[PDB]
Structures are given as C-alpha cells and as structure tokens.
Amino acid sequence: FQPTNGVGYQPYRVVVLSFELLHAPATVCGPKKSTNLVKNKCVNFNFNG
Amino acid sequence: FQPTNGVGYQPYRVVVLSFELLHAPATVCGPKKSTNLVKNKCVNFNFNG
Fold first, then answer.
1. Handedness of CA A6, A7, A12, A18 (dihedral sign)
2. Mutation test of the interface with chain A: which of B1, B2, B5, B7, choosing the one with the most A Cβ atoms within 10 A?
3. Collapsing DSSP states into helix, strand and coil, what is residue B36?
4. What 8-state DSSP symbol labels residue A43?
5. What is the b/e burial string over B28-45, where b = at least 16 CB atoms within 10 angstroms of the residue's CB?
6. Rounded to an integer, what distance in angstroms lies between the CA atom of residue B24 and that of residue A42?
7. Which of A28, A30, B10, B36 has the most C-beta neighbours closer than 10 Å?
8. What are the angstrom distances between the C-alpha of A16 and each of A8, A27, A48, B29?
9. Which residues does B11 contact at the CB level (< 8 Å), separation at least 6?
10. Which residues of B touch A1 (CB under 8 A)?
C-alpha cells in the first residue's frame, strides 16, 4: 500500500457483521426503550423481537 | 479534497525555506561543533559560514 496509489490499490477496512436468526434466547437487541405491561387490551407488541 | 481522489489530486503541504544571505551577522547556523581559536599558523577556518 502506497499513499500515492490509486483507489484500486487503496487500503479499505471491512467489518462483516453476521447475525443468526435462529430461535433461541436472544441476548443482543437494539436501543429501543422497554415499555410497561398492558394486559387484557388489544396492543401491538415486540416481545424480544 | 477526497481520499479516493486521483494521484494528482491529493493534498500536499509545501514549506518553502528561503535563506536570506545578507552581508550581516548570520543568526541561523547549522549544527556544527565549534573549535577553539588557534592562531599564527596556516589553518582552515569556518568563520560564521
């Protein structure tokens, strides 16, 4: 790698995030806030995704 | 300026050092160790450059 090289020979850093969609206890989630529990009313829900 | 630019389009920092050399007491000298004065003999000398 030279600083005077073109964009073809330019150093690029690659991160490949791999996710498993298999059914299991999920450990990593987004930053969404956790609401309270509303019972006996028709609600949308996202129960751990 | 883009890091993906061509070889003619990168930033270049340029410092131009112009050495003013007036017939005057010189104040910018190189890193040369001085020698104590020896007189009355045929010697080389570097007096203020």
1. negative
2. B7
3. coil
4. -
5. eeeeeeeeeeeeeeeeee
6. 94
7. B10
8. 20, 19, 24, 56
9. B1
10. none
- A6 with B7: Cβ contact below 8 A: yes
Q: Return the number of CB contacts < 8 Å for A and B.
A: 11
Resolution in A: 3.6
Approach to solving: cryo-EM
Say if residues B19 and B27 touch (Cβ distance below 8 Å): no
The answer, for A4 touching chain B at a CB cutoff of 8 Å, is yes
The last residues before gaps in chain A (C-N over 2.5 Å) are: none
